[PDB]
Design an enzyme around this catalytic site. Sequence first.
Site, mmCIF file in Angstrom:
data_model
loop_
_atom_site.group_PDB
_atom_site.id
_atom_site.type_symbol
_atom_site.label_atom_id
_atom_site.label_comp_id
_atom_site.label_asym_id
_atom_site.label_seq_id
_atom_site.Cartn_x
_atom_site.Cartn_y
_atom_site.Cartn_z
ATOM 1 C CG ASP A 1 -5.301 -23.193 3.765
ATOM 2 O OD1 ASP A 1 -5.840 -22.121 4.109
ATOM 3 O OD2 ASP A 1 -4.276 -23.674 4.315
ATOM 4 C CG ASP B 1 -5.689 -22.202 7.946
ATOM 5 O OD1 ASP B 1 -4.746 -22.807 7.411
ATOM 6 O OD2 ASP B 1 -6.059 -21.083 7.537
ATOM 7 C CG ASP C 1 -8.913 -20.198 5.212
ATOM 8 O OD1 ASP C 1 -9.748 -19.829 6.062
ATOM 9 O OD2 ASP C 1 -7.726 -19.804 5.208
HETATM 10 CA CA CA Z 1 -3.047 -23.154 6.221
HETATM 11 CA CA CA Z 2 -5.527 -20.350 5.503
#
Ligand code: CA
Ligand code: CA
Length: 327
Positions: free
Chosen positions: A196, A194, A251
């Site tokens: 961030d 992911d 995120d």
């Molecule tokens: Ca990450």
């Molecule tokens: Ca994350």
Amino acid sequence: WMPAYACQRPTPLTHHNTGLSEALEILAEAAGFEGSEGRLLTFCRAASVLKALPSPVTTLSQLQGLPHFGEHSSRVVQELLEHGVCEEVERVRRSERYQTMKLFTQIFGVGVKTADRWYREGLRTLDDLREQPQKLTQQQKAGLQHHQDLSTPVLRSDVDALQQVVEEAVGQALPGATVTLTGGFRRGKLQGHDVDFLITHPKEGQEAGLLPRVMCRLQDQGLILYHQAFERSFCIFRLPQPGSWKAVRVDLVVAPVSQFPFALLGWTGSKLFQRELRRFSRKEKGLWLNSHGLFDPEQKTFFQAASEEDIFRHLGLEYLPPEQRNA
DNA sequence: CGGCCTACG
DNA sequence: CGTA
DNA sequence: GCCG
Ligand SMILES: [Ca+2]
Ligand SMILES: [Ca+2]
Ligand code: NA
């Protein structure tokens, strides 16, 4: 020589004992699947110690005195050195329980407790879960729907494109607000599961209400596949690709600028580095660390920090740049 | 013996 | 519980 | 599982 806490020693991204550390991390993962967070922590700590060594371990002798190596972790390394495999690790790797728990827990929205219940109920494959949609939260449905894309490593070109669209939404929502890449990419990783981002504004208080406005602007441009006052959002983005798109986990975190150094430190990781740093803070210095601040519970005051460096210094730790936090 | 990071969604 |  |  080797300090006991991971936050007391540099851990680079590339190291010299990957084979041993990966085996210990299998046992740590398996310990988590059986509900023993303590054994997980020890195996994770032992693996991390090997990542911080300057050279390959070739002899059991070289483990002498290292923290978090006792009879069990040492026997695992011993077998790997002598035979190139550890029977316990191989038994775990090939077990139906390990394979299914890994499959289920890698789904966004599914943790150990949920995966274990599904395992006990007889479920074994992603298709089994799809067959029973009533048993899924909205978060789990999104995780399963986008599972193929979410299993594809996120690359740097993805990060740069995502940062651009997040910066545009943030600038539309609040002039002067900033976007900082955190997580593994800030530590120098070339891939991730992911991306961030940490969002703030230089004038304390102006960031109030920002994340909903950012999310509305991203969703109006068709960029949001899943999300959901709030200050953290664990999203799935519809990232444009040449002629198409792919789902990417993102995120987003908003912090007031007074907390920004603490949020930056927390969200940059690694996860083990930050748990170790918070443990060190409380157990060795009597101070309580989180992503909002550093609290002295006897004086009932918060430490004013302008930088990550200030936080390390207030804890009596030598500063480590993000690329050396790969514990 | 018990502790093992943290708090938001 | 999930984020993890 | 290791340690204070
Ligand atoms: Ca990450
Ligand atoms: Ca994350
Ligand atoms: Na998961």
